[PDB]
Amino acid sequence: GSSGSSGCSDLPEIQNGWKTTSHTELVRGARITYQCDPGYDIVGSDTLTCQWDLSWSSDPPFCEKTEESGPSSG
Questions:
Q1: What is the C-alpha separation between 39 and 23, in angstroms, rounded?
Q2: Residues 6+ apart with CB under 8 A from 68
Q3: Residue 70 Ramachandran class (φ > 0 left, ψ -120 to 50 alpha, else beta)
Q4: 61 is in which domain, residue-wise?
Q5: What is the b/e burial string over 14-24, where b = at least 16 CB atoms within 10 angstroms of the residue's CB?
Q6: Pairwise CA distance, residues 50 & 30, whole Å
Q7: Alpha-carbon distances, residue 19 vs 2, 22, 30, 40 (angstroms)
Q8: How far is CA 55 from the centre of its chain?
Q9: 64 by DSSP, 3-state: which?
Q10: Can you give the CATH number for the domain in which 70 is found?
């Protein structure tokens, strides 16, 4: 029984953000990192791991704008 072909499914492109992972081939244990634009915040789990069922713990997060005006409070 020598056969693999197991690995999570490529995550969908995220708006105002991009994923960054060390290993290209999504395999068990792999850790995904979600990064959004400077100034926004992530809602959910910033880090997503691949379960033994080839399914991420939960759906991917998203980027949300925060109530802020300008770089300095003022």
A1: 28
A2: 39
A3: left
A4: 1-74
A5: beebeeeeeee
A6: 6
A7: 31, 10, 13, 15
A8: 13
A9: strand
A10: 2.10.70.10
Structure tokens at 34: 């979600």
Query: Do 25 and 54 form a contact (C-beta atoms < 8 A)?
Result: no
Enclosing H/E stretch for 35: strand 31-36
How distant is the alpha carbon of residue 2 from its chain centre? 31
Amino acid at 29: G
Number of domains composing the chain: 1
End-to-end CA distance of the chain: 66
Residue 69: what residue type?
Answer: S
Encoded amino acid at 33, one letter: T
